[PDB]
Amino acid sequence: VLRDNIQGITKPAIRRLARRGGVKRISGLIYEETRGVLKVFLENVIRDAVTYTEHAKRKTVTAMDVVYALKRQGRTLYGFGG
């Protein structure tokens, strides 16, 4: 069983992300809030991809199903896939 994977996002990673996004000062609970938001978004995206893979009569999620789920959610992605 896989556990302790939610704490995989280290503090320097979020610090570099905030520095790239233009944030010059970070508090304390911002890391936990961003972790929860990313977890919720990943859960929704994975659920959509699982539904698409089950509709396609497959098991391994491919890049085409990921692009389809991203277009259904409302955020297109170019470059990856086709």
Partner: protein
């Protein structure tokens, strides 16, 4: 030896001028697989899908950080707070 609140702009420019990835690969793949195991087990990933999901999450986090920084600047505060991310998630419409 430098003063605080001055060397942060150099790191910001260095991270903005580069287009490399900041999040790792093995922990992200482990977290994605652990989340996918909650719905249906015996699931595989062709790496490219995990990279696409990581890029999408990076873009979403960058946009959220930009919105939070803009809201904090408008609120006369260089630092951010959980109430700022709450206001961002409330105004953006996402829950």
């Amino acid at each position: 030896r430098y003063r605080p609140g001055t060397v942060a702009l150099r790191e910001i420019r260095r991270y903005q001028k580069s287009t490399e990835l900041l999040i790792r690969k093995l922990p992200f793949q482990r977290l994605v697989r652990e989340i996918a195991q909650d719905f249906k087990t015996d699931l595989r990933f062709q790496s490219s899908a995990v990279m696409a999901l990581q890029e999408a999450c990076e873009a979403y986090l960058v946009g959220l950080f930009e919105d939070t920084n803009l809201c904090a600047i408008h609120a006369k505060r260089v630092t951010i707070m959980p109430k700022d991310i709450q206001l961002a998630r409330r105004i953006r419409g996402e829950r």
